[PDB]
Amino acid sequence: MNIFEMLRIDEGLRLKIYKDTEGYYTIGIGHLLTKSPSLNAAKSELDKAIGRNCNGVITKDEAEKLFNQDVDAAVRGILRNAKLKPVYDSLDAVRRCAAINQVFQMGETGVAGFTNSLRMLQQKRWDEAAVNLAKSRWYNQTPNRAKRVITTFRTGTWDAYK
Numbered sequence: 151m152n153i154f155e156m157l158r159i160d161e162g163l164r165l166k167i168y169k170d171t172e173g174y175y176t177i178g179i180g181h182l183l184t185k186s187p188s189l190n191a192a193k194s195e196l197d198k199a200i201g202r203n204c205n206g207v208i209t210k211d212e213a214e215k216l217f218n219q220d221v222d223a224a225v226r227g228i229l230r231n232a233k234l235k236p237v238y239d240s241l242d243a244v245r246r247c248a249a250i251n252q253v254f255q256m257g258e259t260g261v262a263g264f265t266n267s268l269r270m271l272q273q274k275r276w277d278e279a280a281v282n283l284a285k286s287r288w289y290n291q292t293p294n295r296a297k298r299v300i301t302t303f304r305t306g307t308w309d310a311y312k
């Protein structure tokens with residue numbers, strides 16, 4: 151297992167514009183297009199990201215390309231963050247995938263305010279961090295996914311992704 155496979159599992163793959171769990175226009179492998187509710191803004195955003203007139207539809211390769219860029223951006227966002235960086239570097243490889251997942255789904259912002267969890271993870275208090283992480287709107291809105299990420303942080307194995 152690796153980050154791409156993991157995220158492909160959590161986000162799925164859709165080649166036509168769709169609405170995410172929060173009702174926002176998205177495409178491909180969880181690639182957010184816009185928070186606005188105007189489909190047209192969304193199509194404009196898609197065309198600009200792809201570089202051609204898509205008319206709301208993309209190819210598999212195009213999707214995968216956005217996905218590459220997006221995984222990369224996420225990691226790089228983590229590395230640039232002062233609160234995040236030190237934590238991330240303290241983790242092993244599996245757990246780092248779980249960190250990237252979260253940032254991919256919620257932004258560096260969202261994650262940057264999980265202060266108490268940050269600390270617990272840095273101290274390697276797995277079970278404690280796991281409980282703390284579940285006390286969140288993130289877990290409450292997307293429990294199945296949050297469960298898999300939390301298990302991942304908790305155990306350092308790919309079991310939740312089976």
Ligand SMILES: CCCc1ccccc1N
Pocket residue numbers: 228234235237238248249250252253261264267268271
């Ligand atoms: C709870 C925050 C977990 C975390 C630590 C380091 C980098 C990214 C993320 N998501």
Ligand SMILES: [Cl-]
Pocket residue numbers: 198199200219
């Ligand atoms: Cl792009």
Ligand SMILES: [Cl-]
Pocket residue numbers: 291292293294295296
């Ligand atoms: Cl879910």
